[PDB]
Amino acid sequence: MTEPIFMVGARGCGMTTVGRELARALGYEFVDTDIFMQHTSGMTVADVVAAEGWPGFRRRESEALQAVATPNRVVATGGGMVLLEQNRQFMRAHGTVVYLFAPAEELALRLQASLQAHQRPTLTGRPIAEEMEAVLREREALYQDVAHYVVDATQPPAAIVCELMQTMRL
Numbered sequence: 001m002t003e004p005i006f007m008v009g010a011r012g013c014g015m016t017t018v019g020r021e022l023a024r025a026l027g028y029e030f031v032d033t034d035i036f037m038q039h040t041s042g043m044t045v046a047d048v049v050a051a052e053g054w055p056g057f058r059r060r061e062s063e064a065l066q067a068v069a070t071p072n073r074v075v076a077t078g079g080g081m082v083l084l085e086q087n088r089q090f091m092r093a094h095g096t097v098v099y100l101f102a103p104a105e106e107l108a109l110r111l112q113a114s115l116q117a118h119q120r121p122t123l124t125g126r127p128i129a130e131e132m133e134a135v136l137r138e139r140e141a142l143y144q145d146v147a148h149y150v151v152d153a154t155q156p157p158a159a160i161v162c163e164l165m166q167t168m169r170l
């Protein structure tokens with residue numbers, strides 16, 4: 001029982017807290033592809049895309065996934081890791097995938113909270129909201145497609161780990 005465990009979902013849904021705790025209960029080491037990328041490709045998307053394009057950003061992400069995926073590890077992934085099929089296929093072939101689920105409506109509400117004081121209706125408000133929800137829902141369908149297991153990540157982290165330990169049988 002030694003395969004890495006991949007955590008997928010949006011960031012801000014307790015991947016770090018759940019990941020570390022889970023690692024602690026199994027004697028595994030916790031790692032995070034986004035930190036790996038900051039360390040090896042720098043702190044900005046802008047520098048990588050300017051130098052190597054979106055395809056070179058995706059390549060560095062895919063290499064980070066493959067580099068940290070060794071036995072006895074719980075791997076947190078970037079919110080966009082599931083966007084390319086090759087990453088989804090890699091994850092399923094090399095270990096167990098847990099989706100920390102948060103409804104696309106809640107993610108939209110989190111974006112609003114961080115960016116706008118409230119929400120008075122405006123002519124352009126719903127259309128733009130609608131576009132952002134469509135993109136959130138397309139990504140959600142890919143989180144679901146790659147997952148072996150899905151846990152409600154709108155629960156506190158301790159309740160998630162316990163359900164995963166039951167769900168995955170530990």
Ligand SMILES: [Cl-]
Pocket residue numbers: 009010011078079080
């Ligand atoms: Cl994200």
